[PDB]
Each structure stands twice: as structure tokens, then as C-alpha cells.
Amino acid sequence: IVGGYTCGANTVPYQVSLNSGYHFCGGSLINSQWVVSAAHCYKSGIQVRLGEDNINVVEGNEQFISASKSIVHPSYNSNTLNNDIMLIKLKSAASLNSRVASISLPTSCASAGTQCLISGWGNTKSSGTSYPDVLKCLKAPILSDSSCKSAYPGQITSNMFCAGYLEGGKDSCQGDSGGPVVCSGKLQGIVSWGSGCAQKNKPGVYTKVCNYVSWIKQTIASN
Ligand SMILES: [Ca+2]
């Protein structure tokens, strides 16, 4: 997260870190056994880390649970990043508490202009590299479909939306990938892609979760 703020320990209790020997992507806990992340975050040997603030210090509220299964969207296209969504099932149920909690799925898609909360342990610089230890947050508005399509001509599908600030300075970034965009209490986006980070006229692009609630529910009902 570029241009963001320190969230405060455990104030984003649905935020997970995916670890394969190191933090490599975010995710969102949607019930005690399931995490939503980005398909482009697929790797084998994932450990889900719940209840994290400082990802490099054991602070006492963590739950580390291995993935039992990963399910990339059937229509995920890594070339275009269309359908950039994946489910991760945990080997054991998380213990839900004040610091580890699920986030609601959407029933309807989010309004343009809605201020949403994006979070993660990704790069905090727009030029150069600095990865934070503690969880960073950013409040960012959903942009109009027209301004999103203008920004990335030919590349935006109905399964994507843009959010952020056209003037630059505030954005999600590498390492935040797979993490949540929460609007009005619902998981409406997943951190997916963008041209650089926090650059003028190049806003963040997010998976539009409300297009996937039927697949999410059917998959969790069968696995
Ligand atoms: Ca920790």
C-alpha cells in the first residue's frame, strides 16, 4: 500500500497473509475454513496466516493453518487477468474471535464513488521498494467504468473495476495482491493488477467479487 496508514493491530480481522516461506500475497477469510484470494497468487505449499499484524514477529494472536486445497477460477486467464480469483480451503477451521473474523460476501455490486478499505503488506513506495512489517490500510473510491476503461484501453472486462486516485500518490501495490477491498461491510474487490503503483492516470484494478458469489457458494458447498 502506497500512501496509506498503519491499520492498527487486528482491526482488519479478515485479512490474511499467504506464506510459502515468506509473505507473498494477501487474502480474505470468508468463513472458518475458506479464504478468497487472487488466482495470480496461486502457488503450491501455502500456509494461511490469520490474526497477523507484524508479519515478522510472533505477537500472540496468530493462527497458522496450512492450505488443504487451492481452487483457481475455472475461467481464469493469466494473460488478461480476467477472473482473477481463487479459493483456498484450510486444513482445519480457524477459531473465530475478536481478532480473526470473516468478511461478508456482497449481495449486490458496489456503487461507483463508494469509499472502500484496501489493506496489505505490499510495497509502500511508488518509486523504489520498501515492504512494511505491519498491516497497512488505504481508503480509496471506486472509479467509474468509463474512467477505468479510458485508463487501460482494451484491457478492462466486466469482471474488473478500478479504484484509487488518478492524480497518483495512493494505491495498492505488489505484495498486496489477493487482498481485500471492503465496501459497506462487504468484500467487493480483490487486489489484482495495475500499471506500476500510485502512478498518475494508472489506478488499481480489482477483481469484481460480486460477479463470483454464485461460484463461491457452489464451490464451498461441494468441497
Ligand atoms: Ca505476527
Curated annotation (Swiss-Prot):
Which SUPFAM superfamilies is this protein grouped with?
Trypsin-like serine proteases
Can you tell me which residues form the catalytic site? Answer: 40 (charge relay system), 84 (charge relay system), 177 (charge relay system)
Sorted alphabetically, the keyword list is:
Calcium, Digestion, Disulfide bond, Hydrolase, Metal-binding, Protease, Secreted, Serine protease, Signal, Zymogen
SS bonds (residue pairs)? 7-137, 25-41, 109-210, 116-183, 148-162, 173-197
User: Where does the chain bind Ca(2+)?
Assistant: 52, 54, 57, 62
Q: Which domain of life is it from?
A: Eukaryota
One biological process term in Gene Ontology: proteolysis
- A family per Pfam: Trypsin
Q: Where in the cell is it found?
A: Secreted, Extracellular space
Which cofactor is recorded for it? Ca(2+)
Q: Does the keyword Metal-binding apply?
A: yes
Query: Into which EC class is this enzyme placed?
Result: hydrolase
**What does the tissue specificity note say?**
Synthesized in the acinar cells of the pancreas.
Q: How is the cofactor bound?
A: Binds 1 Ca(2+) ion per subunit.
InterPro entries named among the record's database cross-references: Peptidase_S1_PA (IPR009003), Peptidase_S1_PA_chymotrypsin (IPR043504), Peptidase_S1A (IPR001314), Serine_Proteases_S1 (IPR050127), Trypsin_dom (IPR001254), TRYPSIN_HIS (IPR018114), TRYPSIN_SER (IPR033116)
Activation and inhibition: Is inhibited by scorpion cyclotide trypsin inhibitor TopI1.
Post-translation changes: Subsequent cleavage after Lys-125 leads to alpha-trypsin. Further cleavage after Lys-170 yields pseudotrypsin. A cleavage may also occur after Arg-99.
Per the UniProt record, which EC number(s) apply here?
Answer: 3.4.21.4
Binding sites annotated in the UniProt record for substrate: 171-172, 174-175, 177
The entry lists its GO molecular-function terms as:
endopeptidase activity; metal ion binding; serine-type endopeptidase activity; serpin family protein binding
Q: Which residues form the Peptidase S1 domain?
A: 1-221
Gene Ontology CC terms:
extracellular space; serine protease inhibitor complex
Assembly, in brief, is:
Interacts with SERPINA1.
- Name the UniProt record assigns to this protein: Serine protease 1
Q: Which organism is this protein's natural source?
A: Bos taurus
